[PDB]
Design a protein around this ligand. Structure first.
Ligand SMILES: *[C@@H]1O[C@H](CO)[C@@H](O[C@@H]2O[C@H](CO)[C@@H](O[C@H]3O[C@H](CO)[C@@H](O)[C@H](O)[C@@H]3O)[C@H](O)[C@H]2NC(C)=O)[C@H](O)[C@H]1NC(C)=O
Ligand SMILES: *[C@@H]1O[C@H](CO)[C@@H](O[C@@H]2O[C@H](CO)[C@@H](O[C@H]3O[C@H](CO)[C@@H](O)[C@H](O)[C@@H]3O)[C@H](O)[C@H]2NC(C)=O)[C@H](O)[C@H]1NC(C)=O
Ligand SMILES: *[C@@H]1O[C@H](CO)[C@@H](O[C@@H]2O[C@H](CO)[C@@H](O[C@H]3O[C@H](CO)[C@@H](O)[C@H](O)[C@@H]3O)[C@H](O)[C@H]2NC(C)=O)[C@H](O)[C@H]1NC(C)=O
Ligand SMILES: *[C@@H]1O[C@H](CO)[C@@H](O[C@@H]2O[C@H](CO)[C@@H](O)[C@H](O)[C@H]2NC(C)=O)[C@H](O)[C@H]1NC(C)=O
Ligand SMILES: CC(=O)N[C@@H]1[C@@H](O)[C@H](O)[C@@H](CO)O[C@H]1O
Ligand SMILES: *[C@@H]1O[C@H](CO)[C@@H](O)[C@H](O)[C@H]1NC(C)=O
Ligand SMILES: *[C@@H]1O[C@H](CO)[C@@H](O)[C@H](O)[C@H]1NC(C)=O
Ligand SMILES: *[C@@H]1O[C@H](CO)[C@@H](O)[C@H](O)[C@H]1NC(C)=O
Ligand SMILES: *[C@@H]1O[C@H](CO)[C@@H](O)[C@H](O)[C@H]1NC(C)=O
Ligand SMILES: *[C@@H]1O[C@H](CO)[C@@H](O)[C@H](O)[C@H]1NC(C)=O
Lengths: 49, 263, 49, 384, 48, 48
């Protein structure tokens, strides 16, 4: 399963220049659409499991 | 000067398959890594273009319709295709547009022209100095009301060479919309003997002329004692644009790299 | 079990970098909020699930 | 006043339960303006357009191109000489703040009653048979009575319209042709016949004519905007160009707020603006230095305020969600931002979470049960 | 509206004409979010 | 109808400039000597 924008931090160096162009996630974030992180990380779900 | 050049052979009319050619950049905006859906007057994919050629023996320069605009292209050597006439009456009852790439300059002009029955430009061939010399301009006998004119900065373009296959493909799209005559074009180097090459490449916009005339038809101008001559071999193709919906793919470098004809 | 939590800032989606637009969106009132409550309700529920 | 008062305001309550609450986004504001236009100086030749010695007939309307010059539409628009200065895709005040691709002035003379027919969407013998505008015309129609300039007591018959046509003409078509028109069902040959007409007619323009029956000169200005490399502009000086800082830019009338950057996007010669999937400009060619600048919006994100209950404590912590801390301290209230309370910029208890930069809460190594959920495994609580 | 771009309206029109174009974009954009949030509230019940 | 406070503004202009007295207008009268607010409530009355 190939996730999109897990909420885990964005920092200009990965959203302009080269990684501005081939990016839907940026098109989204630049228009006020934001994806938030789950409360339990994929490590915490694996500890419960 | 005006002459009916009558030394030619009789052939039936030829046609060819325009596989995926005649797409152009639809507006002056940059895009990259995207698939863009646009409706414009585009050349339909796998459509029959009409086909024309110069041989030895053959020299077809006919009047053709110009309805909803034209895709024009030529597989070429030695600079034989030199221009086009566009208009409605072609006989100074109305205005008409002249485009012509002569030996030294390009000229673009709009007049009540009185054009010739068979118009062409002509060259003295290999005459002792080993230089080919442009010497004839058989296109209009009068030019009565010139509302637009342009001539390029001057140049020399060569008039000579012989090869077993064509070396240039030049492609063009012409549209006459709301008083503006729009030209798009592309150059690509080739090695093909006698067909419109199978492939894809997109035409960039070139020039946008405010000419304000009706164009219903058009006629191309070829380069050649008043009859009996050699036609230097070159071949050209004519297709008609249709209002259609295309999906255009831009690569990472922002160039239209592939297309889908929606119909 | 869950889906991507999304927060959308309607004020930035609709009136992107304009005060002139923002002053017109206030004439629709609670519309900008009621959407944030709805998406926050969905987002809070992804942690519950 | 402070993040707690902003939640009290966002919840519309003077007391707030224990929780984490969303509040209006932080957004870094423009440090300064930038303006960029082509560095042309010569003014547009309007003396040859509006003050030519004689105008064309409306059947043979002249078309003059305006290029490689600087406009000042305040010289035109503020003049009382114009009986009409009506715009169809711009407001007349904005013309000095704006850039134009290719510009054509259409010059001709008509009767004063026919100025109403020059507008887009109109019809009647002028609009139908000698001068048509397109439905989506962008530009302005400018007109004035030229009675004293061009009219003589017997009639200045040098100015002509077209009374007859086989079909209505297309937008920006011009018909010079003198072909005879047959209004009868019979064909006709030679020069003249019964119910057969010369298609042009001269106006009886005399200075004794009633207002409306007097000659009006018209200029139609027919420019196209904001989509292509400009050749005419308003009388505004370019600023210097700065990069990697948040600015209010303006490139050829493309105003916007963003951080500029040196792009590797390879524009082909004919392009000036590049667009994003959202249909917004994300790169531009600078008109003085022919290089491509990436435009990105200023740093922003949601602001979530973490609070024990108002019934317990007025202390709160702030999550700048989706942000690297690096940016928080950058968000210095030295300049403008959406939020005002820059009080937390102190830090000395800040924390980088996977959810964003968290300020006003102390990171502790001892795990507890979840209390107020922050995201990505982090939770906050109010404790001794 | 005369454009999809909110700034190309304000680049061209004064406060009288711009409000007519901008209220079109507010009307359509706000309808676009209500459609999204409805479809997401309905999807959240399938995931629940 | 009933009115809270009422002010009559009395002045003389050229007949061409009556178009400039309306709210949202501009030109040397509206810009340099008599401006109405965008949200003007009231009526403009004129005669030669
Ligand atoms: C290609 O076609 C051109 C016309 O379409 C033609 O241009 C013509 O060239 C002659 C000679 O240079 C000009 O003659 C005039 O030149 C100047 C004008 O100031 C005078 O000093 C001369 O006495 C003479 O009057 C024509 O005026 C010019 N035509 C136009 C419309 O500019 C080119 O010569 C052609 N080139 C080749 C290589 O054939
Ligand atoms: C966009 O245009 C770019 C420039 O034309 C192009 O990059 C170029 O790609 C070629 C082919 O991979 C490289 O060719 C050279 O590759 C190595 C050096 O990296 C040499 O060992 C080879 O012999 C060969 O000369 C070019 O070096 C590279 N250009 C540069 C300056 O890096 C992209 O491929 C284009 N992008 C798309 C999507 O078409
Ligand atoms: C540009 O030129 C076109 C060709 O001259 C012109 O179209 C022509 O319009 C006339 C008048 O309607 C037509 O006349 C014939 O109309 C039908 C058949 O089409 C007959 O029933 C009539 O008896 C009459 O003979 C022409 O047939 C028609 N020709 C073409 C090729 O279109 C355009 O109207 C012109 N465009 C403009 C803007 O002026
Ligand atoms: C926040 O941004 C800073 C940069 O300001 C990141 O720090 C960089 O991290 C990499 C990997 O450790 C180093 O190679 C760089 O030299 C660091 N530079 C600086 C100036 O810090 C930091 O990793 C970012 N944090 C997050 C969570 O994204
Ligand atoms: C926030 C905090 O106090 N973190 C500490 C860290 O400084 C220390 O190095 C580590 C030692 O294991 O324990 C934890
Ligand atoms: C192209 O022309 C051929 C004639 O050889 C015809 O059979 C075919 O249907 C035509 N196709 C199109 C798309 O015009
Ligand atoms: C060669 O060119 C010159 C002028 O450049 C001309 O006078 C001469 O006639 C030419 N010779 C031939 C054989 O064409
Ligand atoms: C034309 O001349 C008049 C005076 O006759 C002047 O007021 C006006 O500014 C001039 N306009 C242009 C475009 O030169
Ligand atoms: C701007 O000025 C530089 C020289 O200062 C020049 O290279 C450039 O051509 C000018 N801009 C335009 C649009 O010509
Ligand atoms: C809140 O605290 C006040 C005392 O400061 C007390 O009177 C009140 O009952 C408390 N309410 C709740 C809901 O805890």
């Amino acid at each position: 399963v190939t996730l999109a924008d897990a909420g885990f931090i964005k920092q200009y160096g990965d959203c302009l220049g080269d990684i501005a162009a081939r990016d839907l996630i940026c098109a989204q974030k630049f228009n006020g659409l934001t994806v938030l992180p789950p409360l339990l990380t994929d490590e915490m779900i694996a500890q419960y499991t | 000067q005006c002459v009916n050049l009558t030394t030619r052979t009789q052939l039936p009319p030829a046609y060819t398959n325009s596989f995926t050619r005649g797409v152009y950049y639809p507006d002056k905006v940059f895009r990259s890594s995207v698939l863009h859906s646009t409706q414009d007057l585009f050349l339909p994919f796998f459509s029959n273009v009409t086909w024309f050629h110069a041989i030895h023996k053959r020299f077809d320069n006919p009047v053709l319709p110009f309805n909803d605009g034209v895709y024009f292209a030529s597989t070429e050597k030695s600079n034989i295709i030199r221009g086009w006439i566009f208009g409605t009456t072609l006989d100074s009852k109305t205005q008409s547009l002249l485009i012509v790439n002569n030996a030294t300059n390009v000229v673009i002009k709009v007049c009540e022209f009185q054009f010739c029955n068979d118009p062409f430009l002509g060259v003295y061939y290999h005459k002792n100095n080993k230089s080919w010399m442009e010497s004839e301009f058989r296109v209009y006998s009068s030019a009565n009301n010139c509302t637009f004119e342009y001539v390029s900065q001057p140049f020399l373009m060569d008039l000579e060479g012989k090869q077993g296959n064509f070396k240039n493909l030049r492609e063009f799209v012409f549209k006459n919309i709301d008083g503006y005559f729009k030209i798009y074009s592309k150059h690509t180097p080739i090695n093909l003997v006698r067909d419109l090459p199978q492939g894809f490449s997109a035409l960039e916009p070139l020039v946008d002329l405010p000419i304000g005339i009706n164009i219903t038809r058009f006629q191309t101008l070829l380069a050649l004692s008043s009859s009996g001559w050699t036609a230097g071999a070159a071949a050209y193709y004519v297709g008609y644009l249709q209002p259609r919906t295309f999906l255009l793919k831009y690569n990472e470098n922002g160039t239209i790299t592939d297309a889908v004809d929606c119909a | 079990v869950s889906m991507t939590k999304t927060s959308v800032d309607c004020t930035m989606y609709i009136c992107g970098d304009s005060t002139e637009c923002s002053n017109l969106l206030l004439q629709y009132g609670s519309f900008c909020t009621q959407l944030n409550r709805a998406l926050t309700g969905i987002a809070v529920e992804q942690d519950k699930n | 006043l402070d993040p707690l008062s902003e939640t009290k305001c966002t919840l519309k309550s003077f007391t707030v339960e224990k929780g984490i609450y969303q509040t209006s986004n932080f957004r870094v504001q423009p440090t300064e303006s930038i303006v960029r236009f082509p560095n042309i100086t010569n003014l547009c030749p309007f003396g040859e357009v509006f003050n030519a010695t004689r105008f064309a007939s409306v059947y043979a309307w002249n078309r003059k191109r305006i290029s490689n010059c600087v406009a000042d539409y305040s010289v035109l628009y503020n003049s009382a000489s114009f009986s009409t200065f009506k715009c169809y895709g711009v407001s007349p005040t904005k013309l000095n703040d704006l850039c134009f691709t290719n510009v054509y002035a259409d010059s001709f003379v008509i009767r004063g009653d026919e100025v109403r027919q020059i507008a887009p969407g109109q019809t009647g013998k002028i609009a139908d048979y000698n001068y048509k505008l397109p439905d989506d015309f962008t530009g302005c129609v400018i007109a004035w009575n030229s009675n004293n300039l061009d009219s003589k007591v017997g009639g200045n018959y040098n100015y002509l319209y077209r009374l007859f046509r086989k079909s209505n003409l297309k937008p920006f078509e011009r018909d010079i042709s003198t072909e005879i028109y047959q209004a009868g069902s019979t064909p006709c040959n030679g020069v003249e016949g019964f119910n057969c007409y010369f298609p042009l007619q001269s106006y009886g323009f005399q200075p004794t004519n009633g207002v409306g029956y007097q000659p009006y000169r018209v200029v139609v200005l027919s420019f196209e905007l904001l989509h292509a490399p400009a050749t005419v502009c308003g009388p505004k000086k370019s600023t210097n160009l700065v990069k990697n800082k948040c600015v209010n830019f303006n490139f050829n009338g493309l105003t916007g707020t963003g951080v500029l950057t040196e792009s590797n996007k390879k524009f082909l010669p004919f392009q000036q603006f590049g667009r994003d999937i959202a249909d917004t400009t994300d790169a531009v060619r600078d008109p003085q230095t022919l290089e491509i600048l990436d435009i990105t919006p200023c740093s922003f994100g949601g602001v979530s305020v973490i609070t024990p209950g108002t019934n317990t404590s007025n202390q709160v912590a702030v999550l700048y969600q989706g942000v690297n801390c690096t940016e928080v301290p950058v968000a210095i209230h030295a300049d403008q931002l959406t939020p005002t309370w820059r009080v937390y910029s102190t830090g000395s208890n800040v924390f980088q979470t996977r959810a964003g930069c968290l300020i006003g809460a102390e990171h502790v190594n001892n795990s507890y049960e979840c209390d107020i959920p922050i995201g990505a495994g982090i939770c906050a609580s109010y404790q001794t | 509206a005369i454009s999809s771009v909110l700034n190309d309206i304000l680049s061209r029109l004064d406060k009288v004409e711009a409000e007519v174009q901008i209220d079109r974009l507010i009307t359509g954009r706000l309808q676009s979010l209500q459609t999204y949030v409805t479809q997401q509230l309905i999807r959240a019940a399938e995931i629940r």
